[PDB]
Structure 1
Amino acid sequence: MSLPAHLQQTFSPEEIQFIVENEPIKIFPRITTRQKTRWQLITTDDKALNNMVAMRSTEVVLWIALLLKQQSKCSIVAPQWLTTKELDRKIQYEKTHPDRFSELPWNWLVLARILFNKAKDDFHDPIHELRGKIQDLREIRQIKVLKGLKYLNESHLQLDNLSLLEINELRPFITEIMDKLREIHTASL
């Protein structure tokens, strides 16, 4: 029909990346846009781009930061959460509590991949260590998700601080099973 079959009542990973790139990020410009043509974007603020000085940190959308990095005109600032120490702290937090979820940013999986691919030499920590820590976090989250799927009911469910990618993963199965259970319960009454 007007919309494909797989795009009905859910999202696609490409659209999730599209959503994630609409957020701001900090970068180190390599040129001097500030005066002693100029950007007039309409969807995003253009004042910051027109006023950038080399080596002075500024804030711009992630999509524009990647576009600048494509030409090698800026250096992206890796967020504070990505650093190793924070990752070990979050892994310990996850291990200590076998019931609750950690409080990582909602875009902690898409941003990780985007930065690991596009910006592989801007981090201040070894890349392999970060990849391993992210893998461990993902595996623990998968375990907890599997354990929590046994409590589906016909009233509601709560998953505090769950990333967008995992919710997208689980949207069809959880929704369909809960809908079937709710239909059975409604028929029973």
Structure 2
Amino acid sequence: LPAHLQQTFSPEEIQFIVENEPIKIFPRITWQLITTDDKALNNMVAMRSTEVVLWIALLLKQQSKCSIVAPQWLTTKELDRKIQYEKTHPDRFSELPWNWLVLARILFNKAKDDFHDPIHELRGKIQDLREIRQIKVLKGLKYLNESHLQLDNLSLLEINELRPFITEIMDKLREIHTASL
């Protein structure tokens, strides 16, 4: 019996989920491990790009034996066209890595060192897009009615925290109207 949350996913859970996503890195390394579902790999070439699951990358990076690739989608200069595209589209939320919130929080824990001036940089940049995305949630949130929601593009993290909000809502709405029938 979970008690809490328990219906919504924990942010610690969803990040625990996003850990499962594969990404390329630059190992210092040159048994097996067989593991289970990895399928990878032959002992990896030092200073070479290879796609691997996220949390394992945290491992060798935790020993600093590996160098994680920066997301191509993660370019602050590149990200402005999104906020550019976002600032000109009051409706659409544009495009998302879909895990990216936890990433940046996690990316800057350790892997921060790999990027060029991530410091004092995207954190603000990402933050602006974070709320401008978030603000557009509530602005469209006034439209909220049963039985349909066009949620479109949103980061699941905020989607998770918003879960208790609307899920508790429309059920009232759907109930009250349908009950009214």
The answer, yes or no, to whether TM exceeds 0.5 is yes
Map of 1:6 onto structure 2: 4
Unaligned runs of 5+ in 2: none
1:164 is displaced (CA, Å) by 0.7
What secondary structure is seen at the aligned counterpart in 2 of 1:5? Answer: coil
Unaligned runs of 5+ in 1: 32-38
Alpha-carbon RMSD: 1.7
Q: Distance in 2 between matches of 1:107 and 1:123?
A: 19
Contact between 2:27 and 2:47, CA under 8 Å: does it hold in 1?
yes
What secondary structure is seen at the aligned counterpart in 2 of 1:63? Answer: helix
Q: Distance in 2 between matches of 1:76 and 1:151?
A: 42
Contact between 1:106 and 1:164, CA under 8 Å: does it hold in 2?
yes
Q: Distance in 1 between matches of 2:33 and 2:180?
A: 56
Map of 1:85 onto structure 2: 77
Contact between 1:49 and 1:60, CA under 8 Å: does it hold in 2?
no
After TM superposition, the score normalised by the length of structure 1 is 0.89
Change in Cα spacing, 1:46 to 1:107, as seen in structure 2 (3 Å) is closer
Structure 1: 4+ residue segments shifted above 6 A: none
Q: Return the match for 1:71 from 50, 63, 69.
A: 63
Deviations 1:86-134 (A, max 9, x none): 2111110100111111211111101111001121210023421111101
Q: Distance in 1 between matches of 2:125 and 2:142?
A: 27
Contact between 2:33 and 2:41, CA under 8 Å: does it hold in 1?
no
What secondary structure is seen at the aligned counterpart in 2 of 1:145? Answer: helix
Which stretch has the larger CA shift, 122-131 or 143-152?
122-131
Contact between 1:27 and 1:65, CA under 8 Å: does it hold in 2?
yes
1:22 is displaced (CA, Å) by 0.2
